[PDB]
Amino acid sequence: MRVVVIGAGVIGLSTALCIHERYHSVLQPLDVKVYADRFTPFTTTDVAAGLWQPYTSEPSNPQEANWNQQTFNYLLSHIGSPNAANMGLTPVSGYNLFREAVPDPYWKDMVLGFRKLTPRELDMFPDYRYGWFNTSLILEGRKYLQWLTERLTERGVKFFLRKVESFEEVARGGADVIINCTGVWAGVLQPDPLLQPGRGQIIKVDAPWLKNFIITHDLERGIYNSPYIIPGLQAVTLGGTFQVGNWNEINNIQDHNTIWEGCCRLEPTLKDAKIVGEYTGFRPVRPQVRLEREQLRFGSSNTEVIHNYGHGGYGLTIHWGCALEVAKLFGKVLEERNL
Amino acid sequence: MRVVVIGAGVIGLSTALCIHERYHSVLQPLDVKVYADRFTPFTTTDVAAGLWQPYTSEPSNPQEANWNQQTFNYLLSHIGSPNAANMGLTPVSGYNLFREAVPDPYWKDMVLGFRKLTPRELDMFPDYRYGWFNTSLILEGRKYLQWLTERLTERGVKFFLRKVESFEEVARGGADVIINCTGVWAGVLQPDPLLQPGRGQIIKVDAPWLKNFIITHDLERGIYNSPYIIPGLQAVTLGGTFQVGNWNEINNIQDHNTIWEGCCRLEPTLKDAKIVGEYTGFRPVRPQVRLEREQLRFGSSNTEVIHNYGHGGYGLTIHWGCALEVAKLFGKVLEERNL
Ligand SMILES: Cc1cc2nc3c(=O)[nH]c(=O)nc-3n(C[C@H](O)[C@H](O)[C@H](O)COP(=O)(O)OP(=O)(O)OC[C@H]3O[C@@H](n4cnc5c(N)ncnc54)[C@H](O)[C@@H]3O)c2cc1C
Numbered sequence: 001m002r003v004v005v006i007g008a009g010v011i012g013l014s015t016a017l018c019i020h021e022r023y024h025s026v027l028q029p030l031d032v033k034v035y036a037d038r039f040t041p042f043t044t045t046d047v048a049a050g051l052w053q054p055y056t057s058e059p060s061n062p063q064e065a066n067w068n069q070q071t072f073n074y075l076l077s078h079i080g081s082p083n084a085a086n087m088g089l090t091p092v093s094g095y096n097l098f099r100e101a102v103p104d105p106y107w108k109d110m111v112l113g114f115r116k117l118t119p120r121e122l123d124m125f126p127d128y129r130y131g132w133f134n135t136s137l138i139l140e141g142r143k144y145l146q147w148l149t150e151r152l153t154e155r156g157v158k159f160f161l162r163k164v165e166s167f168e169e170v171a172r173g174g175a176d177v178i179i180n181c182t183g184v185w186a187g188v189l190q191p192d193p194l195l196q197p198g199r200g201q202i203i204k205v206d207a208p209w210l211k212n213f214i215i216t217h218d219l220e221r222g223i224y225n226s227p228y229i230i231p232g233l234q235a236v237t238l239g240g241t242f243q244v245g246n247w248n249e250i251n252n253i254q255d256h257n258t259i260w261e262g263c264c265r266l267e268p269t270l271k272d273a274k275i276v277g278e279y280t281g282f283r284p285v286r287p288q289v290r291l292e293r294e295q296l297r298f299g300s301s302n303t304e305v306i307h308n309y310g311h312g313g314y315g316l317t318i319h320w321g322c323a324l325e326v327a328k329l330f331g332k333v334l335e336e337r338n339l
Numbered sequence: 340m341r342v343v344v345i346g347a348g349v350i351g352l353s354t355a356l357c358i359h360e361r362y363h364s365v366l367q368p369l370d371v372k373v374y375a376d377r378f379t380p381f382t383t384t385d386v387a388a389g390l391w392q393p394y395t396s397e398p399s400n401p402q403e404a405n406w407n408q409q410t411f412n413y414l415l416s417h418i419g420s421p422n423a424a425n426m427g428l429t430p431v432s433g434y435n436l437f438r439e440a441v442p443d444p445y446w447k448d449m450v451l452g453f454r455k456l457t458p459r460e461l462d463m464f465p466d467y468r469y470g471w472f473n474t475s476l477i478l479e480g481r482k483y484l485q486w487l488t489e490r491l492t493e494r495g496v497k498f499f500l501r502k503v504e505s506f507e508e509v510a511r512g513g514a515d516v517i518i519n520c521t522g523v524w525a526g527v528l529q530p531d532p533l534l535q536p537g538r539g540q541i542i543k544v545d546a547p548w549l550k551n552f553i554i555t556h557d558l559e560r561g562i563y564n565s566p567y568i569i570p571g572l573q574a575v576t577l578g579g580t581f582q583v584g585n586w587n588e589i590n591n592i593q594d595h596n597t598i599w600e601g602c603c604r605l606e607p608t609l610k611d612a613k614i615v616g617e618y619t620g621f622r623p624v625r626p627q628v629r630l631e632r633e634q635l636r637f638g639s640s641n642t643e644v645i646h647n648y649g650h651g652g653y654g655l656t657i658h659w660g661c662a663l664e665v666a667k668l669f670g671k672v673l674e675e676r677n678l
């Protein structure tokens with residue numbers, strides 16, 4: 001059947017692969033195509049700090065906790081292959097610092113080695129007073145997007161640079177099923193007032209001596225509104241901004257300065273780091289991932305649409321669980337159509 | 340007074356600085372000079388993997404344990420300054436893997452976060468069956484040697500490229516005190532059958548995605564005779580050889596192959612690493628650090644000699660404790676001479 005995925009960010013590509021991986025065998029004819037108006041390096045995914053770490057607060061949908069877990073185990077299963085770095089993966093250990101005691105995250109047990117910092121540890125970070133340590137994984141968005149792209153391409157999936165104006169337009173094109181993985185732009189194909197851009201700028205820097213991630217938190221100020229430093233495969237990502245409702249896509253000088261000075265304070269050796277670039281992107285903020293099936297009549301054609309968007313500051317961290325869930329709904333769509 | 344340090348490896352330079360730092364104030368005249376036939380990048384120190392980690396077994400002279408501890412705290416005290424990376428320092432977390440249970444090292448409490456690996460952790464390293472994890476520090480020998488060198492130079496200490504033939508030769512040159520920090524070559528100035536070269540080759544590689552150290556152990560085969568990978572500031576050090584009594588200073592292809600294949604098996608992603616160089620050096624192996632004062636009559640001149648050599652595979656790890664001890668003996672020499 002004709003299936004069309006709209007989106008080429010981590011959600012779209014992982015989902016496409018996930019399904020094709022499960023159904024090519026079963027459905028003889030299984031035509032996947034991917035439409036997107038932006039491919040890496042232009043997706044929001046390419047801008048991601050690259051770390052696997054859910055929010056500190058519990059999720060609204062409890063399945064989100066599963067999805068996160070399934071994603072981590074799936075990623076860990078690759079640690080050990082010769083390809084892990086080629087897919088954009090590597091373990092990284094690091095700190096979560098806070099200004100005051102805070103309850104353990106629901107994810108303490110998903111990551112490896114979770115534990116509270118000791119005082120000699122905290123002495124390395126004077127403004128903070130409570131914190132955790134745990135090892136997790138890095139999944140660079142750009143590298144991972146390219147990897148999924150080659151995998152998809154070899155499985156025969158086709159890509160097309162296109163801006164979709166409506167699902168109708170796609171249904172008319174003969175799509176039996178359509179997977180919406182439009183990220184913050186999903187509202188355009190169909191309004192969702194719950195969805196909003198969580199803008200964030202980052203500064204990429206060359207500072208190889210930094211081997212661990214460090215993430216600061218300011219409870220008053222909101223998540224990701226505080227300095228964080230996260231080593232990646234080739235460079236370090238400096239960061240710190242999450243602004244809901246802001247659509248400005250231009251890097252701004254003010255954000256740059258606050259991110260730089262904050263990090264520079266937290267890790268003074270940054271003094272010698274070479275800045276390699278700055279970027280801004282929109283977390284697709286929503287109270288809960290919208291992941292559900294919906295049918296659409298276009299005259300005489302029910303065309304299923306399965307949504308998968310609204311991942312906020314955690315799309316990398318949970319993409320696999322969602323891709324699986326979508327495969328499952330797609331499974332139902334198949335049994336209704338009688339395979 | 341005239342003081343002459345023989346050696347420009349980590350032991351000689353740290354010791355010189357240590358003393359000058361303590362006595363320049365007190366002794367009005369305090370003439371330090373450093374003689375060495377090899378300066379960085381030619382010392383054994385420049386070849387060090389760069390990690391702070393004592394042996395797994397406990398020391399013979401118990402003071403070694405304190406020297407190690409004093410060294411770690413001294414190093415940690417710098418984590419936080421803007422200069423830490425310039426001195427060659429950065430924290431690094433990592434694994435010690437073994438083929439069977441083993442008792443906790445006497446140093447578990449000196450390092451940060453020591454703990455035993457869990458099974459999900461061990462699944463990332465299939466040949467191994469027991470292990471630890473802890474964060475420690477990297478101190479790159481080459482960078483640190485250059486840093487100490489600038490510090491010494493600015494304090495007015497003088498350097499001279501000179502092969503010393505005998506202490507006599509130096510005493511005749513008017514040295515009131517002489518600090519022997521000759522490493523494996525100390526036997527030449529005065530025989531010590533306990534001292535032997537622990538040869539070791541390493542391969543430097545460019546593989547920035549590796550953020551944690553990994554050190555393997557084979558009990559039958561001896562310490563450091565097993566693959567280990569240790570990220571440094573700019574490159575990764577691959578290693579694995581410790582051969583007592585071997586004086587071959589030439590890198591050999593057999594060692595290279597075994598080190599490469601072993602590491603490559605332990606971390607398959609090395610498949611894509613660029614090799615940047617290979618080097619070999621001699622750990623100054625001895626059952627215990629020789630650190631003691633000895634007087635020497637050269638006709639009518641007692642000339643004190645204070646030895647500090649025999650640090651094996653742990654000179655970086657303990658250099659500061661020793662430098663302090665030497666300053667202390669030097670202190671006595673001063674009170675005997677009545678300041
Ligand atoms: C600065 C920053 C740091 C972050 N760090 C992390 C992190 O460390 N860890 C983590 O887990 N998460 C992180 N995130 C969150 C993560 O980046 C997002 O959750 C995730 O990238 C969303 O992916 P997506 O595919 O849904 O969106 P995108 O990657 O933006 O993909 C959307 C795709 O849909 C296409 N598209 C949209 N509308 C149309 C249309 N009308 N027609 C055709 N194509 C269309 C776009 O071209 C693009 O191809 C971060 C985000 C930001 C901004």
Ligand SMILES: Cc1cc2nc3c(=O)[nH]c(=O)nc-3n(C[C@H](O)[C@H](O)[C@H](O)COP(=O)(O)OP(=O)(O)OC[C@H]3O[C@@H](n4cnc5c(N)ncnc54)[C@H](O)[C@@H]3O)c2cc1C
Nearest residue numbers: 346347348375376377383384388389390503522654655656
């Ligand atoms: C491959 C390898 C990996 C290692 N990794 C680590 C590690 O990760 N961590 C750790 O703690 N330790 C490590 N070590 C051990 C550490 O390298 C040695 O303990 C330490 O470098 C010894 O320093 P030193 O100053 O005593 O010797 P050197 O640095 O070799 O200094 C000796 C100095 O004396 C000079 N000299 C000698 N004889 C004379 C003479 N007759 N006249 C004039 N000058 C003379 C030499 O030119 C040189 O200047 C490692 C060693 C090796 C070989």
